[PDB]
Amino acid sequence: GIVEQCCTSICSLYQLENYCN
Amino acid sequence: GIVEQCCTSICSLYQLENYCN
Amino acid sequence: GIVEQCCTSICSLYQLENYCN
Amino acid sequence: GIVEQCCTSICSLYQLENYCN
Amino acid sequence: GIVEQCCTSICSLYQLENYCN
Amino acid sequence: GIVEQCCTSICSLYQLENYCN
Amino acid sequence: FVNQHLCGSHLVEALYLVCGERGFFYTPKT
Amino acid sequence: FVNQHLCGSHLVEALYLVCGERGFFYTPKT
Amino acid sequence: FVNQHLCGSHLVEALYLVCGERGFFYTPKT
Amino acid sequence: FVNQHLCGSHLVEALYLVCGERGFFYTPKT
Amino acid sequence: FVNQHLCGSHLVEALYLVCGERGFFYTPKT
Amino acid sequence: FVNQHLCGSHLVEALYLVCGERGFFYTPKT
Ligand SMILES: [Cl-]
Ligand SMILES: [Cl-]
Ligand SMILES: [Zn+2]
Ligand SMILES: [Zn+2]
After folding, report:
1. Which residues of D touch L29 (CB under 8 A)?
2. Which domain, by its residues, includes G22?
3. Which sequence ranges are marked TM in the entry (chains G, H, I, J, K, L)?
């Protein structure tokens, strides 16, 4: 999920948009 | 809502707890 | 102390109140 | 400038990107 | 006090240093 | 640089001034 | 606990703290 | 832009930034 | 609520949140 | 991405996020 | 160092930074 | 004052604090 995609791994700002409503 | 309420007047941690999944 | 209770170990919000004045 | 602009009215991430090295 | 002073007008790091243990 | 001086190693507030404009 | 005056990112901070591993939803008005 | 590690309250700060008014969900249980 | 690791400035953010007007002491030497 | 209302340290936060490893310059008026 | 306009949690931030391992006491008025 | 580890957004928070109006550069590539 977000923690694996963004904290454990590395993510872009565009990826972070995946979790907007 | 909570977002506006906490900013405009005050807010409690207990009310915030309603927003956890 | 607080660092051992809360950072090295794990603590609750109720525990954090131990350090209010 | 950007500092005052983001504070006084609004600002975009794209405009902010102009300030990276 | 310092809390109100730093918020209402300005505050210096040196004055803040008075609050360390 | 700043990351080596301040994050990897340890630095003072006076050192941090090295990177003001 | 005491009452809170929380605005902008400081709300999201408080929510993070309060909810921890359960996480939360941040839903502002319009 | 860039790719960095975003953990904990820094993750939710970033979500606030990117999503803003849209709002977001932080769900670490996935 | 929950139990997480709270370190450094994140510890004092949390204390600010919980204590607020009551005020607090942060004393890492214990 | 959405528009931002950023003030004080919150601007420096946003800049950190946006620029990452390239870093940035923070230059306010007078 | 320069003069500071610090409010809410941003004061507690500054105090954390300034005092480090000695820690500090945060004591607001009423 | 004191000497601590200052990393990431905590580094740039500290620079904001110390430099303030002077402004600063954060250049992790050095
Ligand atoms: Cl503010
Ligand atoms: Cl951290
Ligand atoms: Zn703020
Ligand atoms: Zn952190």
Report:
1. 21
2. 1-30
3. none
